[PDB]
Amino acid sequence: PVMADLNGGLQFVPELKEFTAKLRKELVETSEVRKAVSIETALEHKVV
Amino acid sequence: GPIKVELPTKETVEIGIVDYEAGASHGNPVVDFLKRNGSTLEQKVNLENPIPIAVLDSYTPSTNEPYARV
Numbered sequence: 001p002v003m004a005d006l007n008g009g010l011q012f013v014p015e016l017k018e019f020t021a022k023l024r025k026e027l028v029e030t031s032e033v034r035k036a037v038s039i040e041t042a043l044e045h046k047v048v
Numbered sequence: 049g050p051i052k053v054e055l056p057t058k059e060t061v062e063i064g065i066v067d068y069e070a071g072a073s074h075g076n077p078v079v080d081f082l083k084r085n086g087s088t089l090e091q092k093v094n095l096e097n098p099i100p101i102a103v104l105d106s107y108t109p110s111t112n113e114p115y116a117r118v
Contacts (some may be wrong), residue, residue, distance in 0.1 A: 043084070044077040048070065 005011075013019055051064040068078045109115075 040081065043080065047075040047077045047080045048073045 010016065049066050050062045051066055052060040052062045054060055066078060068076070
């Protein structure tokens with residue numbers, strides 16, 4: 001019986017769960033911050 | 049105006065300034081932003097129901113000369 005590992009080296013990263021959570025948190029935070037800043041800039045422009 | 053932070057002792061201490069300056073504009077964006085996001089702190093706090101005190105009658109004088117002079 002054979003065990004093929006087609007994992008792409010994913011096992012070598014330490015704390016893969018926490019690192020993936022950090023990546024998702026960074027992307028989500030950047031997206032939400034940019035969206036909020038854009039909305040507030042738009043509202044400031046419209047009121048001005 | 050000043051921007052202050054609420055310390056753990058419920059004391060507001062200045063930590064910044066709001067300083068908005070603009071030429072021709074249709075409104076003040078600072079007030080709109082604060083109204084939309086924050087909450088308004090009203091010093092006056094209404095009671096659950098009004099408490100009537102009294103209904104009083106006052107007769108206005110015929111002549112306004114003494115009040116005008118005083």
